[PDB]
Amino acid sequence: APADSLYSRMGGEAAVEKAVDVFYERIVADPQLAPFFANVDMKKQRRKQVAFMTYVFGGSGAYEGRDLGASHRRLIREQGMNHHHFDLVAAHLDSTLQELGVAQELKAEAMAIVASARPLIFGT
Template identity: 45%
Template sequence: MTLYQAVGGEAAVNAAVDLFYDKVMADPLLVPFFEGVEMGAQNRKQKAFFTTIFKGETKGADAYMRKAHAGLVAEKGLSDAHFDAVAGHLNATLVDLQVPEDLIGQIMGAAAGLRDAVLNR
């Protein structure tokens, strides 16, 4: 069984991404990174990304994340503090949705593994 199936498939991913962005967009530390971003499109991209990662299809994830965030690092100073805030909102989202602890651990581990790619290191 994939992580995608274990968390509940498409409906669970959709609920998680929606709640996640509610939390992110309420965080004054993170809001500046989304100025001018069409959030409907961002939501769809994030749902597709989570679906891919949760299905275990990680080939190219580092390169994708590096490219997607390069401008934010260079132009807006995206840093470890921002990454940690986003990770905290992801963890809180999963707890709010009552995802089992072992699955939260897997998801947060996968997210942590993308830190250097997101921060272009």
């Protein structure tokens, strides 16, 4: 049932779009992460992140973006992207969801789903 996904329960599109917007305002202010995004079109990147999060939170049928591993392979191989950056990024999202008032159980579910992206991203 549409209402029963994590996506729907956390407030659906308005909630995910707001979370992604705040998430990237924190990331571009973070000296440890901002250099990775300094020449990225952040309007397009926000849209891509909304689409990905919507998919893994159960809000869309089938992801139409690029494979996560392929999308970050160049960053890991040539720009020093590493597991510590992943932890920093995850913590920005957790703090964002907390600030936006996401219920603790839903925040835990969302963040476990983000944790599941780690092997995908690093090709482990």
